[PDB]
């Protein structure tokens, strides 16, 4: 599913991501824009053999099981395919565990490089939230 900008904002809010760990809803929408261009079916293979999955490009080395990342863990206790669903629940619950891990949203490279420090409130402008 390719979400609209305000549509994704509303879904993230209902699922409790807004202001989670102090990160406003605009931060989460901006991260999704630059990680996946709002496409739940996005995938990206990394040089180490791990793969990134879904709207927030969550990685198989630590967070989900895909059966093809040797030595990896599955700390969200889910198949990586669950992160590709039109329903964003699995992606949201796993993101909550990642952003509590120690480095905050710096865990998302696209967030650090393209959202951090910017006018992120622009991502939710106009939305009936
Ligand atoms: Cl915001
Ligand atoms: Cl790829
Ligand atoms: Cl594996
Ligand atoms: Cl959720
Ligand atoms: Cl933080
Ligand atoms: N939720
Ligand atoms: N949730
Ligand atoms: Na894994
Ligand atoms: Pt939902
Ligand atoms: Pt939820
Ligand atoms: Pt729901």
UniProtKB/Swiss-Prot annotation:
Q: Name one Pfam family in it.
A: Lys
User: Where in the cell does this protein reside?
Assistant: Secreted
Q: Which InterPro entries match?
A: Glyco_hydro_22 (IPR001916), Glyco_hydro_22_CS (IPR019799), Glyco_hydro_22_lys (IPR000974), Lysozyme-like_dom_sf (IPR023346)
- Quote the record's binding site residues for substrate: 101
Predominant location category: secreted
Q: Which GO terms describe its cellular component?
A: cytoplasm; endoplasmic reticulum; extracellular space
Give tissue specificity per the record: In the egg white and polymorphonuclear leukocytes.
C-type lysozyme domain location, by residue?
1-129
Can you list the disulfide-bonded cysteine pairs? Answer: 6-127, 30-115, 64-80, 76-94
For this protein, what is the EC number?
Answer: 3.2.1.17
Q: Where is the active site?
A: 35, 52
What UniProt keywords are attached to this protein's entry?
Allergen, Antimicrobial, Bacteriolytic enzyme, Disulfide bond, Glycosidase, Hydrolase, Secreted, Signal
Single Gene Ontology MF annotation: identical protein binding
Under catalytic activity, the entry for this protein gives: Hydrolysis of (1->4)-beta-linkages between N-acetylmuramic acid and N-acetyl-D-glucosamine residues in a peptidoglycan and between N-acetyl-D-glucosamine residues in chitodextrins
Q: Which GO terms describe its biological process?
A: cell wall macromolecule catabolic process; defense response to bacterium; defense response to Gram-negative bacterium; defense response to Gram-positive bacterium; killing of cells of another organism
Similarity field: Belongs to the glycosyl hydrolase 22 family.
- Describe, as the record does, how this protein assembles with itself and its partners: Monomer.
Its UniProt miscellaneous note says:
Lysozyme C is capable of both hydrolysis and transglycosylation; it also shows a slight esterase activity. It acts rapidly on both peptide-substituted and unsubstituted peptidoglycan, and slowly on chitin oligosaccharides.
Any idea what job this protein has? Lysozymes have primarily a bacteriolytic function; those in tissues and body fluids are associated with the monocyte-macrophage system and enhance the activity of immunoagents. Has bacteriolytic activity against M.luteus.
Q: What is this protein called?
A: Lysozyme C
Organism, scientific name: Gallus gallus
Gene designation: LYZ
